[PDB]
Each structure stands twice: as C-alpha cells, then as structure tokens.
Amino acid sequence: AVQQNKPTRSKRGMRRSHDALTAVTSLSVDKTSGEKHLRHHITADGYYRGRKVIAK
Amino acid sequence: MRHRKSGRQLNRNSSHRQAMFRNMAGSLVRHEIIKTTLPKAKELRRVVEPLITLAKTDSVANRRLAFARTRDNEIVAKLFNELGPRFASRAGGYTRILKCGFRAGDNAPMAYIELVDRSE
Amino acid sequence: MIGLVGKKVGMTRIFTEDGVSIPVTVIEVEANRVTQVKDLANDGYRAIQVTTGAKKANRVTKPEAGHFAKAGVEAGRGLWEFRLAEGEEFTVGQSISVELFADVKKVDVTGTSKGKGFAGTVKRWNFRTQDATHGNSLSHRVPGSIGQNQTPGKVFKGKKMAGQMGNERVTVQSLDVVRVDAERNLLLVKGAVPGATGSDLIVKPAVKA
Amino acid sequence: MIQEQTMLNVADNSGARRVMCIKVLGGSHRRYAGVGDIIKITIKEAIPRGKVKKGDVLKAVVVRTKKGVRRPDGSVIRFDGNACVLLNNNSEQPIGTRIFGPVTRELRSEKFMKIISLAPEV
Amino acid sequence: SNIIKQLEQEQMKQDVPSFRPGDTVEVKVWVVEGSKKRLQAFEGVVIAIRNRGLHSAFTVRKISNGEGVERVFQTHSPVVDSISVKRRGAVRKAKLYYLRERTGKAARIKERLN
RNA sequence: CGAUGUCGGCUCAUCACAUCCUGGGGCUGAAGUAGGUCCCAAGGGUAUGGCUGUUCGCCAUUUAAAGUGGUACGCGAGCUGGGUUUAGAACGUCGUGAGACAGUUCGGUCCCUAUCUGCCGUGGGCGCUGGAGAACUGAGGGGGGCUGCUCCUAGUACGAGAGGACCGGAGUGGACGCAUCACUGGUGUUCGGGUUGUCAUGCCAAUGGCACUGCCCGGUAGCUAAAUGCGGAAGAGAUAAGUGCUGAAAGCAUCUAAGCACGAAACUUGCCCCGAGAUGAGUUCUCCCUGACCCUUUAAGGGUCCUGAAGGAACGUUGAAGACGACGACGUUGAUAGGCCGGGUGUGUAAGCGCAGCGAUGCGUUGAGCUAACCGGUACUAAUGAACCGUGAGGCUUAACCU
RNA sequence: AAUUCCUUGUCGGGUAAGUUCCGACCUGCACGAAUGGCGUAAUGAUGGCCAGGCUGUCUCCACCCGAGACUCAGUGAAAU
RNA sequence: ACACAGGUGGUCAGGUAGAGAAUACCAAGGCGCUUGAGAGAACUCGGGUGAAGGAACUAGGCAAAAUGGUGCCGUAACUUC
RNA sequence: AGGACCGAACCGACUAAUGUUGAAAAAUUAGCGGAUGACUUGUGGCUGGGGGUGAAAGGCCAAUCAAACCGGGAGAUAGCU
C-alpha cells in the first residue's frame, strides 16, 4: 500500500459539483389521475397509454 | 466466445431454469395471467406460445406431443379441447407481455404476461 | 481518385480447367447520384460528393428535410467525398457509372470489416504466446511490458494495447475484374472483400496492383 | 500437416515401412509440407526387406498425403496416410527398382529422367 | 432475398445427381494436361451427395482391397464428363463418413433390395 | 550496510556501428564458376533442435543470413526456478575436537486487494465570439521497404584439366501484415434420428428428467486454421556512393569551381493510415432565431413581466453490432423482435392402425414425422402526450450608405 | 565409481545431436578388506537411463458448461 | 470470536440399480437454508468436447489423457524353485 | 497357519492444482500410502524444564522453545546503543 496525498475538499469537488445519474424531469400522468408515474409502464390501477390493460 | 444467443442466460443451472419455466407454465394455464419479473415474463413465451398452434389440429399424429413438459393433468384437460382450439382462426399472437415498473421497495424490473383471450 | 459506393450481394465460383474453384465476389452499386462539387480558390480542395441517401421518408433527420427535395429526393446514408481535378462533372450532370472499370484490370476496395469487439491484444497484435506450464500464469493473453526500466518512466507511442478489433474500413488493394454491367450496376471480382450484406463497400481503380 | 516426428509409409522396393520426418526445409522457416515436397527423413525401424539401416538420415519425396491434392486434374485425391519415395544419397532422384501403386505423374518428367523405366499406374 | 441466383444457375446443371450415398459408380474426367486431353475413369461408392446447390461437393471412395482412395469431384465444375451407376446401396443415418472405418464385409453398404 | 533481487532461457523494447544477408563499387595471382581482399551504404532483413545450470561450449539439421555492440552484459509490483545467495547432509581429504575444503553431487522454499506521475479506452463539459446539423482542408506524424527455387539464358563465351557465366523475361513456392468461410477438414448443446442405467406419468402406450451434452451420429446459422488468397507499383522532386563532357582555382591537368547531361533500395511527395485544444480552434453544404419596463458613467449587466425557432435529449423495439458507451436496422408516416404463413436448409420413414413373424421385432399405410439462426409475406402481440434542453439578430474600432 | 583436480577421461554401445545411462580400459591426484571388502536377493513414496502403449505437454489453440467477478437495492471494511 | 464452506462417542441403519454401509434415485421421514434481482465483458476457479497427429513440449511426459469390469484362453528373463 | 496381494469403513497427510490480509487462524478438489495389526480409538490415570517424550529431526512438550510458561530478585551488566 502507498499514499502520496489525502484528497482535499477541492480535489473531491470535481466528483461533487457537476456529476449526473438522475433528474426526475416532468414525469407522466393519465387524464384519469394526477398521481405521477414513469414514461413506459403500467400503473397499479391498470392504466397504460390510454389502453387500460388490466382491471380488478 | 458465444456469439448469437437470443434466449436469456438468467441465473443458476440449466435444470433450474427448465424446472422453473415448466412449473410457471403450469401456473399460467391455471390462472391465464401472471405477475413476475420482466426477464421471466418475456422468456415464458418460449415453447408455450407455439404449443397453441400444435394443439389447434385436434389430430392423432399430434396426440403424443406437447406433454414432454408441465406434466400435470391440468394442461391435458384443456389441450386439444380449448387450449389450442380457442385461437385456431386468429393466425398467431396468443400471449401479451408488458412492464409494470419496479418491485415495491427496490429496483428489480416488474411485468405481467397473459393469454390474449381468457374467461375473467 | 473517384470510386463507387455499394454492397456485397453474394459469393460465386467460376473455376479453372487445371484446376481450382476461383472465388468471385458479387457487388451491386446504388445511389451514386452526386449533389455537390467543391472547387475554385477556396481551402485547397478539388472534390466530388456522391450523397447516397435511400432512407424511409418517415424518419429522415430534420437537417436533411428540404435538403434533397429539389434534387436527389432521398436522405440518410454516408455522404462520401472523393478527390477529383479537371474531369468537369457538375451537380446537373449524370450519376457515377460503374463503366469506370470497362478497361480496368484490377480494383482497390475499402469497406467495413467484420466486427470482433475487444477481441484480445494477442489476437489483434499477433504477440508471441508465453507457455502456461511449469508454474507460469497470467501471461497468456496480454500485450506484455508497456515500457523500459528507470529512464523514460512515461510510456512510448510505439506500444499497443486495448481498443476494438474489426469494423476498420481496411485496405484490400487488388481484386482482378471478372464481369461488369453498367446497365445493371453489377460488378464481379476475383477474391474476398471485407464485411457482409449488413456492411458498406467502396470500390476505386487499383494503384499498387 | 507433415511436420517433425511425423511417421510416413513405403512407396518403393527396398525402402523401409516406418520412416520419420525431421526437417521440412525447401525454403526459409518452413514447418508443414504437402505433395512434391522433399523431406529430411530417418529410418525409425530397420527390417530384412530394406537396403537401409536404422538412424540413417536421408531424403524422400512426398507422393501421398492424408490432406490430399487438387492440382493434378482439378478434382481432389486423398489417401489413408502419408507416403514418400526414398532418394539416392549420392546421385539424387529415386533408387528403388519398382514403385508401388499409382504415385505422381511428375516423378517421370525431365527432372526425374532416370525413373522413366519404372511401371507405376501413372 | 437472393439476387445472385441467376449467376449460380450459370454454373449449376439442371441434371442433379440424386440417389443418396451407397450407390456404386464410375466417374469420368478429361484431365486436359495442357495439350493431352483423354477421358479417364474412377470407380467406387458415393459417400456424399446433394444438396447445397453450387457448394455440393460430391465425394467418392474406392473401397479397394487394402486401399481406401478418396476423391471429391464437384459435378457442377467444368472438369467432369459423366457419372454412371452400376449398383444400388442403402443408408438411413448420416452422410456415410463411416466408410473410412468399415472395410471388406462391412463395406457391402446394402443393395436397396433392388 | 536505517533490504541497491542475481546468472541462464521466454516475452516485450530502444539507439549506434568498424556490414553477416540484401543493395553499391574498387582491387586481384578477377576467363567463368567461385574465392581471396577493401570501403560505399545502417534503407530493408538477420534460426530450429541435442547433451548441458550455463550466457560460455561441443554437436545433428536448416537458411537470402544464422553480423557486432550499448542500455545495471535493458525487461522477477511481466514468468518458471535449473544454477545460487535457507536448514539437510553424502563420499573423499583435512582439524584432537567443537568443524571445514582454490571439494563435488544430491534434497529445498519465489508477494499484492494497481493509488498517484503515466498509457489505453470511453463519456460529459468549455471554446472557436447568436443558436445548431452534417461533411471537408492539413500545422504535423506513423505505416510500407528486403527476400526463395526452377525453366530460358546454358553447356554458349571462356577454360591445361575440372568445368562454366552476366540480364529481363516467365513459371512455381513461402509470409511477417491483412481479408473471408468460399476451397477442404473440425466443431456446432439451439434441428432431427439411434441408445444404456433409474424414477415417473392412475395403468397401457412411448415420453420426459438426471448420469463427460450419460453413450453414438449427421447438420444450419456461426465460429475457425488444422484453409486459401492479395499487397509491398510506376511517376514526380532534390540527392548519396558513383559514371561522363566542357573547363578554372594552383593559366599544365582535372567530373567541379562556373556550366551541363545522368545518378539508390533511403530523403521530400506518390501508395495505406492518422490528425484544427493547429488558444494559430481554418473551409463548405446549408438550417433557424429580428422581446420589453425600471435602474446604473450605464458595450457590462441587475431586478421584473412576456415569448420560443432551428435543432437535441428523454422514451424506446432491436441486431449481421457490443464490457459499458458506441455502431447499423426500426417506433402504425410500422415487418425492429415475438406469433403465424410460405420458401430455404437439416434429419431420416414418426405415433396410431392393420398384417406378417411361435415371439422379440419388423413392414406397409409413408420421401413419413419433425425442422434454429438465412429470406419474403402476414400487423395476430409489443416500440409515452402537451412537459425537458436549447431562443428572442449576437462585443470594440476603421470605413461605406439610407433617416 | 555416491570418492579419478581440470578436461563431456580414452574407446566402443544405444541417440539425428547422449557432460546422464550401458560395456571396457588400470597407468586409482583423494578405492581397499567387520567406522569392512566384493558379489547378490526378497523388499523399496529409494537413485539414474531406454522403448512401446496412450495423450491438449506441443504444433496452435478452437470452444462450451457451471460458480464468482460486473451493475443495483438494504447493510457496509483495510493496508497506506 | 458467529444464525461460521468446520468438528462429532454409541444405535436402527428400508426399497430399486450396483462389486460396493461407492455413487445413483424411490419409501419412512426431511428440505428448497435471512442477502437476492439483473448482467452473463474484461478477469478467476472447477468441469467437459476436437482433426492430423504426437512429446516434436521441458533439465525432466511434471501435469494431462487413453486404459479401467467379468468369465475364459494365455503368461517371458532370472531364480536360492 | 497370514507383521499375505489387492481394496471400503478406519488411519495417515506423499503428489498436483486452488486458496495465500482465506469460506478455512492448512481448508477444498482429484489422486496416493497403510487398512487383523511393529493397526486404530473411547475413558480414567502416570511421565514436567537441563526435566519429560523421541526406533533420533534442534523433531515434539497448550496460537510461546538451541531451553516453554508465571510471581519475585530486577532499575542484572554495557572502553555501549
């Protein structure tokens, strides 16, 4: 094992100031309910892109 | 190595995968709709969807076929009676598979699979 | 030097009497239409551009909409530009004809080779394989030492390691011509070409052949 | 095919039945051979029928191969093993009084003119 | 879709050798040898026949006493005159590659009950 | 000396040369074949095995050659551990002995979780002076180079005798680098047949799991080399070593000085590839954007109210592609994948039923039954909406011109 | 030769090349008679050498099947 | 050290395959186990195919592999038998 | 009649690979030696530091050994660090 430097707040700032993994941008809703979902899946009450694919 | 493979390598040994999809197809002819993971729902289409075409003939030359897997009388009670003959003038497309989001409290991919025509 | 854009359409055999099978590759050229010619006083160029578009009109890029609608009427695909001086072709001329090869002995092919992905450093750079016996390990599929002891301490540009193998447009610089048809855009040549029907192929008159 | 330690079979009278390759030669850095190559060969087992002795290093010309050849008339010729005609250590070309089977129709032309008297099938 | 079919049908013969492996034959070639053209004949059993079109190899094995001589002819090629049958045979598994290991009484290759 | 891993081989590098090969010449007791001998030139190239701790060696066989050196006799966080630099001892010799040899032979040990200076690969961001999409120029550079045998030349010229050519023209091999699954093999679990042991399906029937894919077979798509091919072009430009003419230094003489023809495998370009982060951010094809009030010695902006273009992302179906990115094919303005249909191709005559056969098992019905990846057809299943990003004509100065 | 300096002793056998091995030579630097001599047998994880059988050690890899690595969600280390 | 790829005195030790209280797979009886969902790239360990062959590898067939059961026929040198 | 030949249980831990800041404080995978006996194993006892144990290796005697462990002498001593 070897160590020339312990990384400063400013050195680690290049991994804590501009990185991206998510943005939660706008999201999706059906005209029947304002409870938000993601762009391409079926909701728990059976709604999908205007086709209402399973009912219980 | 490997090159083309269209089927999923999934998890665990080949006899596990065999005895999972054998049993899960039994559950599909028992309920006509299943809630499961996206890889499982989409790989369950294999052999079971063309088995509807195999069963459409009601013929004696097919009588010893389609009972190599899922060997519980639940399937042969429907096979060549309604399982097959219920889709015999549609020309293909007997299963539907669509995604439902993520497993509740984690990130595993959830989906559903159905037979396109079912009594409930 | 100018050339034609096309694809491989299959493989054939024509035989000798002495004799062997003689492999003959079958090539078809498409959409060598020309829509731009670049010359006179600016940036040192003298060149011609073929613009090989053939795409389904329902998914054409917004920059390419209205860009061939007066001449060429199809979009997508490689633009391809070739060097040409004093042959006097214009944008109101005629499509490049494969009759270019009517008296040509041999042709030079440049075309997308079969993909291999990462492949391996010994498979790509043909290094000499160290023996996997007497206790030697982790030495069988590697590029070996990447530079010299003590002095440089910086690695040389002469050493090769990782990347992707295949997909290069390569150099296959001598294929002897067998048959041409300018009325059917058809070319037959002796020997193999890079890639397959899912690839692209460029053919030029030969120069080191 | 046809490399160091490879065993070949007899094709000529007073030649040996077990003969072994030690050099392919006939060019720089060669290791494999076919029909019409000349091989540096050792007698590996010596018998009463042979006019040769074990461990004697000689030359022989290939006339049969288990990979085969298509050059003669444009249709493959392939055999059960590999066989070679033994060559004269002093005056070059074959030394046997008879050759077995068809062999090659080259072993009779103006580079083998001592051999035209023999009666192989081609 | 295949758009070179017309160039494959330039070589391919409309008469395709079609009788399955195990038939006993005589095959003829011209040899040419620059300026020495003569009709030469080879005898044996057909061990490979049909069906990949212009790639169909056509393989014959002599099955002679102490001699397993083998030839590949490509019947669509410019170098073959004729193929003719003298005896029938019968196979019902694989493309007859076992005729390298079968000899003598094991080389009888049935007779199609003909 | 408060640890600088060592000899030998493998594997990977880098620079010189007093030149082994190849290329260029001179001398000769150089006919010719060679050889013997000296620089011109470092542009291209430069072994496989045995015995052996070896590099060092002594040998068997090849080759156009088996050149010579440097770098800790380059390369153990890149390899083994034969030799040795861990205890063991052994036999001989020596010490009285505790032990040792200008002693040898034999047994015995070889690390990593790779962080940073670095290199490879890949994505994001800043900028090129509004906001974008797609190609191109080249400030520079790397790659290629050499090379076998045979036939003609040639049994001539020359040579007591033995022997014995130059050159450009062809054939035929081999391969560093590179392309492909064709040729011909192999493999092909995803397609189909034969089969041993066991358990089971209510039983029969014949079917399935499991045992190196349990055993034996073909075979597609594909993979591959154990397969086959192609390529080191001519020219342009100026030279090296060198061949000449005309003619000066040093009035002769001289290829050198002026002048003039001609000069290499190298050099600069051509051949193949790379490249504008080239603060020196280049060109073209083109595409679109024409806001306001309050306030500041105020080309910068600060607050607030309005309005969005070009063109992108998200969302995705997927494969001849691929770690991941990415790359090509596609999202009903639909054949991208699945189902279905038909071709294409492989396997081998199913099960049932009848008959023959003391019966096992066969035969017919029947070229039967089944058929993946290649291809066309068929929308039967499946491929989000306004929202997001990104605008609202773009700095100084010199000049023209309309108010 | 388990001891013949250095020298593959010198010569022959077997090998394509055998400093190891097999047989001889006597002219043994430092063999030699119970801290034994020499032959030898049954036993031997004993020391060394040859040939066949067979074989992915090798030409030269080509490939396939599990179970980890690789990515996430809950929990969450170190040498230095 | 522990809800640990661990250790463990003595007893009953079923059926079927088998030479076997090997290994396999059926009672009686028991289990699918507190990280598991994706991916099946580099990279790792274990296991298993394949042509011609062939030890050419290496100081050294180390390792790796063919062979592997049973009944019968057969069985050399040398020998203190 | 077996200090018989082979070979399971039973005992050993020779060979190759893996693991080597491990799953294991030497374990696993497949071979290999012994296996009615100069064999092996349960229980309670006896042998103790220059003393045991050892058909003998500087081998073994509680994660400690060319003299183990623990309380005191002890702040041994040093032309020395």
PDB file of C-alpha atoms in Angstrom, chain A residues 6-50:
ATOM      1  CA  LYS A   6      -5.100  12.617   1.101  1.00  0.00           C
ATOM      2  CA  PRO A   7      -7.693  14.202  -1.290  1.00  0.00           C
ATOM      3  CA  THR A   8      -8.702  17.771  -0.319  1.00  0.00           C
ATOM      4  CA  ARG A   9     -12.292  19.163  -0.335  1.00  0.00           C
ATOM      5  CA  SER A  10     -11.386  20.949  -3.631  1.00  0.00           C
ATOM      6  CA  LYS A  11      -9.888  17.764  -5.246  1.00  0.00           C
ATOM      7  CA  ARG A  12     -13.077  15.750  -4.400  1.00  0.00           C
ATOM      8  CA  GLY A  13     -15.203  18.781  -5.568  1.00  0.00           C
ATOM      9  CA  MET A  14     -14.589  17.523  -9.173  1.00  0.00           C
ATOM     10  CA  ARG A  15     -16.771  14.474  -8.142  1.00  0.00           C
ATOM     11  CA  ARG A  16     -19.324  16.573  -6.089  1.00  0.00           C
ATOM     12  CA  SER A  17     -20.328  19.571  -8.319  1.00  0.00           C
ATOM     13  CA  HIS A  18     -21.292  18.512 -11.919  1.00  0.00           C
ATOM     14  CA  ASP A  19     -21.928  14.704 -11.990  1.00  0.00           C
ATOM     15  CA  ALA A  20     -25.287  13.208 -13.146  1.00  0.00           C
ATOM     16  CA  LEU A  21     -27.262   9.978 -12.516  1.00  0.00           C
ATOM     17  CA  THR A  22     -30.921  11.287 -12.317  1.00  0.00           C
ATOM     18  CA  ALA A  23     -33.049  14.482 -12.846  1.00  0.00           C
ATOM     19  CA  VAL A  24     -36.773  13.429 -12.236  1.00  0.00           C
ATOM     20  CA  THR A  25     -37.727  15.722 -15.208  1.00  0.00           C
ATOM     21  CA  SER A  26     -41.526  16.463 -15.606  1.00  0.00           C
ATOM     22  CA  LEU A  27     -42.833  12.800 -15.178  1.00  0.00           C
ATOM     23  CA  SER A  28     -46.044  11.241 -16.676  1.00  0.00           C
ATOM     24  CA  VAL A  29     -49.795  11.296 -15.811  1.00  0.00           C
ATOM     25  CA  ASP A  30     -53.051   9.920 -17.247  1.00  0.00           C
ATOM     26  CA  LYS A  31     -56.131  12.183 -17.735  1.00  0.00           C
ATOM     27  CA  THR A  32     -57.900   9.949 -15.118  1.00  0.00           C
ATOM     28  CA  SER A  33     -55.409  10.572 -12.207  1.00  0.00           C
ATOM     29  CA  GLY A  34     -52.762  13.193 -11.250  1.00  0.00           C
ATOM     30  CA  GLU A  35     -50.737  10.531  -9.263  1.00  0.00           C
ATOM     31  CA  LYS A  36     -47.444  10.517 -11.239  1.00  0.00           C
ATOM     32  CA  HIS A  37     -45.665   7.557 -12.934  1.00  0.00           C
ATOM     33  CA  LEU A  38     -42.691   6.802 -15.286  1.00  0.00           C
ATOM     34  CA  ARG A  39     -42.905   7.087 -19.099  1.00  0.00           C
ATOM     35  CA  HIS A  40     -43.423   3.437 -20.310  1.00  0.00           C
ATOM     36  CA  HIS A  41     -45.010   1.204 -17.561  1.00  0.00           C
ATOM     37  CA  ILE A  42     -48.495   0.187 -16.300  1.00  0.00           C
ATOM     38  CA  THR A  43     -49.807   1.846 -13.050  1.00  0.00           C
ATOM     39  CA  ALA A  44     -51.146  -0.126 -10.029  1.00  0.00           C
ATOM     40  CA  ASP A  45     -54.851   0.575 -11.010  1.00  0.00           C
ATOM     41  CA  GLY A  46     -54.110  -0.922 -14.514  1.00  0.00           C
ATOM     42  CA  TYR A  47     -53.586   2.247 -16.692  1.00  0.00           C
ATOM     43  CA  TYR A  48     -51.149   2.279 -19.662  1.00  0.00           C
ATOM     44  CA  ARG A  49     -51.014   4.869 -22.544  1.00  0.00           C
ATOM     45  CA  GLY A  50     -54.868   5.128 -22.906  1.00  0.00           C
TER      46      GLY A  50
END
